[PDB]
Amino acid sequence: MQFKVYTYKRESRYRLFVDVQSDIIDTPGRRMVIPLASARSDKVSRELYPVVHIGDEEWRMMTTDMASVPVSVIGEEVADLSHRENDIKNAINLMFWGI
Amino acid sequence: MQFKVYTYKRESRYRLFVDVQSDIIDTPGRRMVIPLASARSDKVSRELYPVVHIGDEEWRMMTTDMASVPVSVIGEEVADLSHRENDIKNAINLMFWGI
Ligand SMILES: [Cl-]
Ligand SMILES: [Cl-]
Ligand SMILES: [Cl-]
Ligand SMILES: [Cl-]
């Protein structure tokens, strides 16, 4: 579901992803997601890589590592980032349409 | 480069991808791309999966298989789809923001 955060059931580069696909766009067995990296370089653009807060820690939304995942790898839902829809939307639009 | 079509140097599900990343968005060593599938089911949405023409054949832009690729896998440039920027933009925006 769009803006919900999930763990990977199978080991990936990162440990969390946010679903960014529209809830009325149907891809049977898959969803478009952006991985979240532990925020641990400060000067990297916050416009393209928003900082979000999950499990009492900072994470960078790795916008340029966007990829589809099969539902078979989608594990527990850990959080909802719908309150950050404005920065998520700004980041996604910047990556394709910037300047 | 945005809207340019390339072959994969290493075997992938598909054989072509279109660069969809802005030319002023810098991801050292990588680019955001959408694979092209040989068009060979007709009733699949042309709004979400545009039909394009390369090497005298029809291809579907596999919008929901969007992923980053390392420059190391980017082979020969085979075509330019900049003339289809309107349908490509419509498809990408539909996948995130549809309804
Ligand atoms: Cl991490
Ligand atoms: Cl947050
Ligand atoms: Cl194919
Ligand atoms: Cl075309």
Numbering used by the authors:
A (entry chain A), B (entry chain A): 1 to 40, 43 to 101
Paper excerpt:
The primary experimental system utilised is a 101-residue homo-dimeric protein, CcdB (Controller of Cell Death protein B), which is a part of the toxin-antitoxin (CcdB-CcdA) module involved in the maintenance of F-plasmid in Escherichia coli. To understand the structural basis of stabilization, crystal structures of three CcdB suppressor mutants, namely, S12G, V46L and S60E, were solved. The structures of the S12G, V46L and S60E mutants of CcdB were solved to resolutions of 1.63 Å, 1.35 Å and 1.93 Å respectively. On similar lines, in this study, the crystal structures of CcdB mutants reveal that the suppressors S12G, V46L and S60E possess novel hydrogen-bonds with water molecules or adjacent residues, that were absent in the wild type protein and are likely responsible for stabilisation of the native state of the protein by these suppressors.
The structures of S12G, V46L and S60E consist of a single chain in the asymmetric unit, with two chloride ions. In the present study, we selected three such suppressor substitutions, Y8D, V46L and S60E with ΔTm˃3°C. The suppressors Y8D, V46L and the suppressor S60E were ~3 kcal/mol and ~4 kcal/mol respectively more stable than the WT. The WT could refold back till 2 M GdnCl, whereas the suppressors Y8D, V46L and suppressor S60E could refold even at 3 and 4 M GdnCl respectively. For S60E also, the major deviation is in the starred loop region A39-V46. E60 is involved in a series of salt-bridge interactions with R48, H55 and R62. There is a change in the orientation of the mobile R48 side chain resulting in salt bridge interactions with E60. The S60E mutation has resulted in reduced B-factor differences between the side chain and main chain in many regions, including R48, resulting in overall stabilisation of the structure. The average B-factors of the S60E structure are also lower than the WT with the most reductions in the loops 8–14 and 39–46. S60E, though not involved directly in CcdA interaction, alters the conformation and rigidity of the 39–46 loop that contacts CcdA and might therefore affect CcdB function.
